Amino acid sequence: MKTVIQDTADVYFKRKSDGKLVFTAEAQTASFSQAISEEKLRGGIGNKPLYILKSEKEINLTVKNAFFDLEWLAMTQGESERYEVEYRTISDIYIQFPNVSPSGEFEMSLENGNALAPEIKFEALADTDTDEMAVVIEASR
Template sequence: MGKSVIQDTAEVIITNKETGQVVINAEAQVASMSQSLEETPLFGGIGNKKLFVIRTQKELELTTSSAFFDLEYLAMTQGVSVDKEGKATVTKTETATIAEGKVTINGTPKGKVRIIAFDGEQGDATVSSGSITVPEGLAKDGDKVTVTYQEEVTGRKVEIDSEKFSNKFKVEYRTIAYDPETAIVESDIYFIFDEVVPSGSFELSLSNGEAYAPELTFQVLTPRGETSMGRIIEVPRKSTP
């Protein structure tokens, strides 16, 4: 096993070092690693020749993006867990047709609802026995109106807390290498980083007709009492008889 070809991205396995929770990104689009050094040239002698390069402050940064969206990625940046039974109050809108001065909606509003007529006029109304009485003079029978209201919902929730920041994680990349002579997968290559911190900065941009690919950036740390920031190991595949 010598020279090989890597043509795939990597599977990314992220483990929360506090809770042990594992997030597997098997649909990664990008799994990258970049290293930087602080390099200062040392000059001296006649002509001020370059005699040495002082190299310090090695830094590693990992970046991964996924083809699919998962709230777990955002939870990592916030230092929280996904609340599977989280509650929130959201604003919902429905279009309804007035009949006998009333409209009906599918949701369960909390408090008053707002009726918006086709000409932009608005008015508040209350719900009684599942139906809503349209304010007098706002619109007439047969007109379509927009109904907006507040409703409590339950689902998977990530809290964005100003006093919480991301925890430490372990990140592993696994990709495959091909034998250039036979085009057969000959080994698995693992990139292992024992202690990383996700960047708390992220950008969420939702565009029409484009899939949102969440991206995470990790700063690699050196565990206390150690000098190793990570390791790369190439493991040969066992040949089949």
């Protein structure tokens, strides 16, 4: 007799300047893509005396079942920005991504919004000075 076991995670997306909770949703998928690019970046000998390791790192995140904070919605509705994300998945890890960028696209469904497409995508934005992509914290099991 099969029994499927499924866990869940809570994703907390907020602003940088204050503790204003932008919204809270679930976790659907995460993609850490570290690799290199075409030969156009580095061709012939060039910097042979000092070989430099190039590491292209991308952090994509998807969240589903997202509801926006009422206070933040009221503040923003009545009349660039850098945000952050926090993870509290289960032990239980506390992953925090700072300076993320929310991408997105609008889709229209025939059945008046079948599944309502509540998928929000985030991309990890890295600056020349800032370096901490994710803070991993472990707690009691």
